[PDB]
Amino acid sequence: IVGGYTCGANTVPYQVSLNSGYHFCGGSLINSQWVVSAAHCYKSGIQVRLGEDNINVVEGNEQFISASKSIVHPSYNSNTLNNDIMLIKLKSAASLNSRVASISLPTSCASAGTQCLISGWGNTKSSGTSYPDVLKCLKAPILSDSSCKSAYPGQITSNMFCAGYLEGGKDSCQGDSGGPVVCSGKLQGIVSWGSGCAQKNKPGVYTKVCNYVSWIKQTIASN
């Protein structure tokens, strides 16, 4: 997260870290057994780390649980990044507590101008690299379709939205992928892609979760 702030320990209790010997993506817990992330975060041997604040120090209340299944959307496309959503099943149920809790799925889509909370352990620099120990947070508005399509000609589908600031300086960045965008207490977005990070007139692009609610429910039920 570029231009964000320290969330505060466990203030985003649905936020998880995906780990394969290093943190590589985020995710959001949606029930005790299932995490929503981005399909481009897919790989074998994912360990889900729940209840984290500082990902580089073990305090003892973290839960490290392997993914037993990682299911990309069947229409995911790695070129266009359309349908960039993935469901991870945990090998064992997470134990829910003050630091580990699920985020509600939306019942309706969000609209331009709505302020959302975006979080992650991603790069905090727009040029060069710096990775934080503790979880970072960013408040950002959903932008109009017009703003989004002007920024990303030919690249925006009905399954994406832009969020952020056209002046630059505030954005999600590498390491944030798969993490939450939460608007009025609902998971409306997944960190997906952009042209760099925090660049002028290049806001972050996010998977539009409200389009996938039925698919999520059916996939959870079937697996």
């Binding site: 481009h40 266009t80 990044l81 991603g122 892609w193 952009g194 042209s195 760099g196 972050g204």
Partner: peptide, 14 residues
Amino acid sequence: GCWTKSIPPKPCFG
């Protein structure tokens, strides 16, 4: 350029 926000980043069409 067009990149996913994973570590490491993956390219997108752009």
